[PDB]
Every structure is written in structure tokens, then in C-alpha cells.
Amino acid sequence: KEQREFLPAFAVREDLLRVIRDNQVVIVIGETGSGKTTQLTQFLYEDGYGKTGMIGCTQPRRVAAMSVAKRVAEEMEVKLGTLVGYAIRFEDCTSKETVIKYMTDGVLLRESLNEPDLDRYSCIIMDEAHERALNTDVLMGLFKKILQRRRDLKLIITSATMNSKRFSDFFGGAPEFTIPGRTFPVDILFHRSPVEDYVDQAVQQVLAIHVSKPAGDILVFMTGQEDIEVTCELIQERLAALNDPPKLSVLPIYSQMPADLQAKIFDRAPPGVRKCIVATNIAETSLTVDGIMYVVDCGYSKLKVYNPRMGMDTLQITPISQANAAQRAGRAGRTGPGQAYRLYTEKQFRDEMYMQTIPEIQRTNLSNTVLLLKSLGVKDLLDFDFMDPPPQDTITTSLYDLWALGALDNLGELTELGRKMNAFPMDPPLAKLLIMSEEYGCSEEMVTIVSMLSVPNVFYRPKERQEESDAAREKFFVPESDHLTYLHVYTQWKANGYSDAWCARHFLHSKSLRRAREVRDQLLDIMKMQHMRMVSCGTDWDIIRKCICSGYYHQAAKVKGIGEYINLRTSVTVQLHPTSALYGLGFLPDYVVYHELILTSKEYMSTVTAVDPHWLAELE
Numbered sequence: 150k151e152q153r154e155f156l157p158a159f160a161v162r163e164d165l166l167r168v169i170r171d172n173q174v175v176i177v178i179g180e181t182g183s184g185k186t187t188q189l190t191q192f193l194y195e196d197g198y199g200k201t202g203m204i205g206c207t208q209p210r211r212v213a214a215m216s217v218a219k220r221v222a223e224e225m226e227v228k229l230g231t232l233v234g235y236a237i238r239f240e241d242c243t244s245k246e247t248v249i250k251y252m253t254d255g256v257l258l259r260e261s262l263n264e265p266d267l268d269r270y271s272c273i274i275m276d277e278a279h280e281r282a283l284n285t286d287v288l289m290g291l292f293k294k295i296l297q298r299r300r301d302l303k304l305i306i307t308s309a310t311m312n313s314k315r316f317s318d319f320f321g322g323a324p325e326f327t328i329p330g331r332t333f334p335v336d337i338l339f340h341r342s343p344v345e346d347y348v349d350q351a352v353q354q355v356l357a358i359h360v361s362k363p364a365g366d367i368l369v370f371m372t373g374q375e376d377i378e379v380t381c382e383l384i385q386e387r388l389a390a391l392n393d394p395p396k397l398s399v400l401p402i403y404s405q406m407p408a409d410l411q412a413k414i415f416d417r418a419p420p421g422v423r424k425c426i427v428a429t430n431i432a433e434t435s436l437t438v439d440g441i442m443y444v445v446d447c448g449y450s451k452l453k454v455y456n457p458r459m460g461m462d463t464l465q466i467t468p469i470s471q472a473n474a475a476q477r478a479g480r481a482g483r484t485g486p487g488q489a490y491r492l493y494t495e496k497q498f499r500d501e502m503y504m505q506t507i508p509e510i511q512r513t514n515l516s517n518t519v520l521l522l523k524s525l526g527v528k529d530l531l532d533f534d535f536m537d538p539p540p541q542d543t544i545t546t547s548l549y550d551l552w553a554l555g556a557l558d559n560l561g562e563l564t565e566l567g568r569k570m571n572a573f574p575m576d577p578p579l580a581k582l583l584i585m586s587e588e589y590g591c592s593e594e595m596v597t598i599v600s601m602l603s604v605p606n607v608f609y610r611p612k613e614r615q616e617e618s619d620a621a622r623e624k625f626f627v628p629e630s631d632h633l634t635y636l637h638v639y640t641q642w643k644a645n646g647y648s649d650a651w652c653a654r655h656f657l658h659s660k661s662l663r664r665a666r667e668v669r670d671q672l673l674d675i676m677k678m679q680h681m682r683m684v685s686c687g688t689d690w691d692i693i694r695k696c697i698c699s700g701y702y703h704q705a706a707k708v709k710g711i712g713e714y715i716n717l718r719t720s721v722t723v724q725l726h727p728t729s730a731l732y733g734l735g736f737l738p739d740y741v742v743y744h745e746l747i748l749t750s751k752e753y754m755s756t757v758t759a760v761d762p763h764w765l766a767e768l769e
């Protein structure tokens with residue numbers, strides 16, 4: 150009668166509900182596509198756990214949370230937001246009606262602040278625990294304590310097959326329940342030579358499959374919105390240049406995508422139409438698209454990671470693990486015996502790719518985690534029950550940065566500023582910038598700038614209209630500052646009644662601005678609860694630069710020459726990006742602060758503001 154009956158989870162329903170009734174903690178193991186995320190909440194609902202309180206399901210990815218909530222509301226024939234809802238960083242889609250709530254790890258973590266026993270919940274499913282996301286690890290540590298205080302709470306840990314076997318031991322020998330899998334052998338093809346231009350080669354491989362191969366959808370693994378949009382654009386360009394090719398529906402998947410773009414990936418195309426899904430590793434384990442027969446794997450993910458040449462974080466593409474590569478290839482083995490095209494050699498796979506991914510807790514900036522856990526009451530991270538504890542090096546770096554920011558006092562204790570920063574689901578320096586903007590008389594402007602820094606870049610630079618795009622970008626430039634340029638673009642977008650037609654005409658991403666407005670509206674509410682006044686600096690934009698100079702003092706740099714600056718904290722060379730508004734100035738300024746470092750050909754500053762030297766002196 151129902152599509153949801155073809156799912157492997159449906160057959161173990163009774164056996165699994167028996168294991169859950171008998172044990173506080175259960176580990177559920179099954180392949181991506183088993184029905185773990187869509188079906189487990191419904192099993193618990195139908196078995197009466199929703200009587201006493203809410204059934205929560207946490208996972209690392211925003212798009213998975215939003216999308217599965219929609220699917221489950223449809224399966225259950227309820228309005229999304231009613232019996233089935235979701236909560237993500239910048240959207241609460243729930244009501245007093247909500248019994249099944251899908252959320253991101255971060256949202257449940259923040260709920261434990263004011264509700265340490267998570268009293269509203271009868272059950273929690275910690276889904277996609279095999280990714281070992283930072284906040285997943287923080288939640289397992291929290292649950293170790295909660296499960297003592299509360300003997301009624303059911304914890305279900307969900308895992309794909311790999312990196313699944315340590316959860317049981319961590320929760321005192323919790324029972325494991327495996328949903329058996331059905332996977333076709335996948336033909337894994339390695340590139341003959343190393344790939345320079347993985348975007349170009351991805352597109353060549355997409356169109357070779359499209360014109361030559363029998364029916365079956367394509368899944369392309371890229372790294373971010375940026376290489377995804379370029380890939381989609383180049384597929385359309387080359388497709389339109391071919392002679393009478395079959396139709397192709399090209400659909401992106403990236404973390405910040407709006408709900409309307411998410412819904413598109415699950416639509417069946419007209420008959421005779423192939424789909425090409427161009428995704429990040431969202432499409433590795435977190436969600437399934439029916440009918441995939443061909444995978445194209447770039448071999449990379451994009452992460453903010455410690456860079457030795459910099460002595461600080463850099464946003465960079467980095468090789469995946471051999472485990473990630475197996476998972477990516479496996480997406481072409483669900484419908485029939487598919488193919489996986491790896492844009493990298495067997496040699497590169499054996500020598501340049503680690504067997505496993507290191508847990509995020511051991512390779513990521515810990516500043517949000519330190520600040521969060523000090524709120525929750527935890528003085529030192531190594532006091533916390535981490536499955537894999539973070540290294541002292543990274544703890545020390547965060548303790549230092551949070552002290553320099555003013556979030557910790559000289560004894561390393563939480564300050565009032567540090568507490569206020571925890572109210573904002575963003576990098577501590579970015580929260581500090583928003584908090585300080587009240588005293589600088591520019592909270593109105595700063596919440597706009599912070600909103601623009603929280604969403605994908607606004608400037609559209611299509612590849613067959615680059616001089617026209619560059620020209621339009623230059624008329625929005627405030628040459629002293631990329632931060633003011635973003636404020637300028639948003640203010641002009643608003644002045645034109647938030648028009649999508651205006652954005653296209655000026656080479657701006659409406660989705661970016663629409664997302665910036667979503668974030669702004671949520672930040673305004675947090676600012677209200679934190680009793681911040683909304684004040685405008687009027688025509689004095691200099692005080693915005695001075696405030697930015699205060700929030701990003703730790704990333705001040707001095708001109709070296711020919712677009713090169715020296716980071717004052719580390720004495721490392723960083724390059725100004727040629728796209729920077731600062732190239733509209735008569736000459737490059739002596740002093741800047743920047744938002745972040747990006748690795749492309751070399752280490753570039755991204756989002757740069759000119760600062761007066763006397764501003765830096767005043768500060769510490």
C-alpha cells in the first residue's frame with residue numbers, strides 16, 4: 150500500500166522496538182537508505198513514547214534535518230510544524246503540537262543549557278553518529294551523565310556500518326541491532342593520471358556518462374556551494390553545446406540551500422530525463438536520492454583546518470579518507486550494479502588518503518566547544534567524557550584565543566561577555582562583534598554585516614559574463630572595506646524592495662541575500678532577549694570599521710607589498726584577494742583586519758577592512 154514498506158527498517162520494526170523497550174541505550178546499525186532517519190521516530194511514535202513527551206532525532210547536517218522532517222510529515226499526513234517539526238540553528242519549525250522533532254546536534258546542545266536533563270524528551274535518536282561530528286561527540290559525553298540522572302529516557306544511537314563498533318562500549322555495553330543491507334557490486338574506476346582541474350574533469354565525466362550510458366541518475370561529489378555552482382554552470386554550458394543530447398536535470402545540494410531547492414532533488418524527473426545531483430558529502434550518508442547509478446568523486450571535502458604555513462585556521466579543500474571514498478562509491482550500488490568514477494589515481498588513493506577520518510574533536514578549532522561546555526558547568530575539556538579527547542595543543546589555542554577575546558578572564562573563567570557570546574550560534578569573534586556594536590552605536594548595521602558573513606557570498610561571477618559581472622561588483626564597492634561593501638549591497642537590495650529581478654540585473658545571488666535576511670531576523674530576536682538596543686551610526690561608516698577592528702584585532706595585518714600583508718599575531722604572509730573592495734582604493738592601506746583565510750593557489754585573506762593604526766594601539 151505504501152512506498153515506506155519497501156524499506157529494510159519496516160521488517161525489523163517489532164524486534165527493534167523489543168530491544169528499545171528492554172534497554173536504556175541501543176545502537177542501530179544499517180546502511181544509508183535503510184530507513185533509520187524516516188522510520189525510527191515513527192516506530193517510537195506508534196509504540197507510545199510520544200504519550201509522555203517528545204521524540205527527538207538529532208543529526209549533524211541542517212539539510213538532512215529539514216528534508217527528513219518534510220518527508221516524515223508527508224508519510225504521516227500532518228502539516229510540517231505540527232505533529233512533525235524541525236529545529237535548526239536559525240529556524241524553529243515546531244509548535245505545542247510537535248511530538249517528533251528533527252534537529253541539528255547544536256540545537257539540542259543549546260537546549261541542554263537551560264534543560265540539562267532534556268525533560269521535554271521521552272526518547273532521543275542520535276542519528277549519523279558514525280560521522281563523529283564535534284557536537285555529536287559533545288552530546289554522547291552529555292548523555293553519559295543524563296542517562297544516570299534519568300532512567301526513563303531511551304537513547305538510540307544510529308550508525309552507517311563503518312565506525313559503528315565503539316558506541317556500544319562507550320554506553321556500558323549497549324546492545325547493537327543491525328538492519329541487513331542489499332548492495333550491488335559497484336565498478337570503481339580510478340583516473341589514469343592525477344587531476345589538476347577536478348571541476349573540468351567532473352563535467353567531462355558527467356557528459357560522457359550522459360551521452361553513452363543507459364538510464365540511471367548521476368551523483369557528483371564536490372566540496373561547497375562555490376565549486377558546485379561552477380560545476381552546474383559548466384554542465385549546462387557544455388550540454389547546450391552538444392548536438393541533440395538527451396535532457397539532463399542538474400540539481401545542487403549544499404548546507405545553506407533553501408527548502409525549495411531541497412525539495413527538487415527528490416522529485417522524479419519526466420520519463421526519459423536523467424538527473425545529475427551535484428552535492429557535498431551531505432550525499433555520503435545523510436540522505437539518499439532514488440535511482441543513482443553513476444557517482445563522480447572529486448576526492449575532496451572543504452574544511453576549516455589548522456595550517457602549519459599559517460599557524461592558524463585556513464578554509465581549504467582536503468583529501469577524503471579511503472572510508473569516505475567507499476561510502477561515496479556505495480551510493481551507485483542501491484538501484485543496480487552502478488559505476489563510481491574517482492577523479493584521482495589508485496596510487497593517490499593508497500598513499501595520499503588515510504584509511505579513516507580522524508574524529509572532528511581532534512582536528513577542529515575548539516573555541517565554541519570550550520565556551521559552550523564552560524556554560525554547561527565544565528571547567529576543563531579533559532574533565533568531560535569524550536569518546537576521543539581533544540589534544541592539549543588545540544585546547545591551549547582555544548583557551549588563549551578566548552582569553553584574548555575577553556570571553557575568559559585572566560584565570561580562564563567565563564566572563565559576562567563570554568556568557569553573552571554563548572547566546573549567539575556563531576564563531577566567538579563574530580558574536581563579540583555583534584555584542585560590541587551596541588556600544589559603538591552601529592548594532593543596526595552590524596547585525597546586517599554579521600548576517601552577510603553567515604551566508605554564501607553575494608557576488609555572482611558567471612564565467613561567460615566575467616567583465617560585465619566585475620563591472621557591476623565595482624559599483625557596490627566601499628573601497629575601505631569588504632564588510633561595508635556587504636552592508637552596501639544589502640541596503641541597496643532592501644531599497645529595491647528585496648527584488649530577485651534586481652539581483653539578476655546586478656549579478657547578485659538573491660538566495661544569498663534572502664538567506665542573509667532569514668539570519669538577520671533570527672539574530673534581531675536574540676539581540677532583543679539579550680536586551681541589546683538597536684542603534685544606527687547613520688552616515689558615519691568609519692565607526693563600523695573601528696568596531697570591526699575591535700572584533701577582529703587578532704587578525705590584524707600590516708602591508709608588506711604587492712597585495713601581501715603580514716599577520717601581526719604570527720608574522721605569516723597572507724595575500725589580499727583580487728576580488729577585494731580594497732583594490733578600488735588609490736593605494737593599499739598600511740593596516741587591515743580580515744574575516745578568514747582561504748587556500749586556493751595560495752593563502753588569501755577573505756573579507757578585509759582597512760583600519761587606522763591608532764585604532765589598533767587603543768586595543769589588546
Ligand SMILES: Nc1ncnc2c1ncn2[C@@H]1O[C@H](COP(=O)(O)OP(=O)(O)O)[C@@H](O)[C@H]1O
Pocket residue numbers: 179180181182183184185186187188213215216217218219220415434435436437438439
Ligand atoms: N527529504 C528526505 N531526506 C531523506 N531521505 C528522503 C527524503 N525524502 C525522501 N527520502 C527517501 O527516504 C529513503 C531513505 O530513508 P531514510 O530514513 O533516509 O534512511 P537512512 O537514514 O537509513 O539513510 C530514500 O528513498 C530517500 O530518497
Ligand SMILES: [Mg+2]
Pocket residue numbers: 185186187276434435436
Ligand atoms: Mg539517515
